[PDB]
């Protein structure tokens, strides 16, 4: 469902196990190439505990294959993303998202 494409390699050794918060700075774009979010604009890294299902699914199998410091691009299909309902006013229904994710620190 999620397609990880490495943009710049990290360590390839430490991967986020369950229960380690992940700090990731990111930018997100509808597959047509329009942007809905970036954390870099807000200026703060986004933290989430992997295994608590706070983030969308593809964002959670996706930031799990990445390693520490790696920068990659995820392509979450609506099945492993919001889906047929959408995030009203932000993401149209039946949408595929692309995320430029940089896993900065683990915990």
């Amino acid at each position: 469902g999620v397609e990880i494409e490495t943009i710049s390699p990290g360590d390839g050794r430490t991967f986020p196990k369950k229960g380690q918060t992940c700090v990731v700075h990111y930018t997100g774009m509808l597959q047509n190439g329009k942007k809905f979010d970036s954390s870099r604009d807000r200026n703060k890294p986004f933290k989430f505990r992997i295994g608590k299902q706070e983030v969308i699914k593809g964002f959670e199998e996706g930031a799990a294959q990445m390693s520490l410091g790696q920068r990659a691009k995820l392509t979450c299909t609506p099945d492993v993303a919001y889906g047929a309902t959408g995030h009203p006013g932000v993401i149209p229904p039946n949408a595929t998202l692309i995320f430029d994710v940089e896993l900065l620190n683990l915990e």
Binding site: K34, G86, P88, G89, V90, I91, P92
Partner: protein, 384 residues
């Protein structure tokens, strides 16, 4: 059929009569007790009369033969026409004074109120029908009040506008089907130049007071404008205009109109259909009541927004309705919002459409969240 009605009707135009003496010369003389005179309804031009079938009626102007329509105000019900005086006359009756009984001249009958108050009045409020009686009650005396020149002028403008636009409507209904073919128009000529002039005059009649008008003058003219619009609406001039729009709207373009009316008639189709849409806004602009009338025919307005013949006028009508009535905002559905947004896609980047959409969210300081959510969900996420 006449009535004694109470309430706001005594600030309307259906309650206005005009005393027409039986002499053309010196017709403005001082009314004297017991002199013959017809009484004409102003907004309909129908003369009060005693017909055999229904007693008291308002008969048309072709059947007022001075036996049915003549009358005599009288002071007391005791049994008492004078020799015409070639002057303003000796003043007898006053205004807001001088209790006067109305007596038909030939039948002697006094004007009274029909006592019967049936089930419709068991819980309903009294609307005493006026009947002519042999002897009548002892409390049936009437004060005569005066109406402002604005009201009298408006009540006579309604009598001509209604006639003109009913001729227009009945002319349109003559060739509703009936294609012209390659021959002549169906029936009698449409009153097109008269309609254009009358609409132009009524749009200027209702023009909002100017801004440089100084404060107190501005607030007096606003009251007068609201009054005149209420008169026209309560006499059903916001339905005659709608009927004209509907009849002229079954035709997509001027050539479609020409296929039924004619080339010369179709030369003014777009002009007329724009003047109607301007006059409608002039009638409803600023009145919460005339704008409240559109809580049920809102789909009437929204379904005409794509029409190219007059696309700014219909949008202006919508803007007035939405900016003045808050009850209209509650009946907006996704159908309506997905249509107002489609104007942006089909008619261009027009800021007035955004103004409409802004007015759909907050009306008089209260937010309507369904409209906010619908605009957000439909307009925004496409980013187009």
């Amino acid at each position: 059929l006449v009535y004694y009605e109470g309430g706001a009707v005594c600030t309307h135009a259906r309650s206005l009569w005009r005393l027409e003496p039986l002499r053309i010369s010196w017709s403005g003389s001082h009314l004297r007790w017991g002199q013959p005179l017809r009484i004409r309804h102003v907004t309909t031009g129908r003369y009060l009369a005693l017909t055999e079938d229904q007693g008291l009626v308002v008969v048309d102007a072709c059947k007022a033969h001075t036996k049915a329509t003549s009358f005599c105000f009288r002071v007391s019900k005791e049994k008492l026409p004078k020799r015409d005086v070639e002057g303003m006359g000796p003043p007898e009756i006053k205004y807001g004074e001088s209790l006067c009984f109305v007596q038909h001249v030939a039948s002697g009958l006094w004007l009274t109120y029909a006592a019967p108050d049936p089930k419709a009045l068991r819980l309903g409020v009294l609307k005493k029908k006026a009947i002519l009686h042999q002897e009548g009650h002892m409390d049936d005396a009437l004060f005569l009040t005066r109406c402002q020149q604005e009201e009298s002028q408006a009540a006579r403008m309604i009598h001509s506008t209604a006639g003109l636009y009913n001729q227009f409507i009945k002319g349109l209904d003559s060739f509703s089907g009936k294609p012209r073919g390659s021959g002549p128009p169906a029936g009698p000529a449409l009153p097109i130049e008269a309609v254009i002039l009358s609409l132009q005059d009524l749009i200027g009649y209702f023009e909002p007071p100017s801004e440089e008008l100084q404060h107190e003058e501005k607030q007096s003219k606003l009251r007068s404008l609201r009054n005149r619009q209420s008169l026209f609406q309560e006499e059903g001039m916001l339905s005659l205009v709608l009927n004209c729009i509907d009849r002229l709207n079954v035709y997509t373009t001027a050539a479609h109109f020409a296929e039924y009316a004619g080339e010369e008639a179709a030369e003014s189709w777009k002009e007329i259909v724009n003047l109607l849409y301007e006059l409608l806004a002039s009638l409803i602009r600023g009145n919460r009541a005339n704008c409240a009338l559109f809580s049920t025919n809102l789909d009437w307005v929204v379904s005409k927004l794509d029409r190219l013949e007059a696309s700014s006028g219909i949008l202006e009508v919508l803007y007035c309705v939405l900016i003045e009535s808050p009850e209209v905002l509650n009946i907006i559905q996704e159908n309506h919002i997905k249509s107002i947004i489609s104007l942006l896609d089909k008619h261009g980047r027009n800021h007035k459409v955004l103004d409409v959409l802004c007015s759909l969210c907050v009306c008089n300081g209260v937010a309507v969240r369904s409209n906010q959510d619908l605009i957000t969900e439909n307009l925004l996420p496409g980013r187009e």
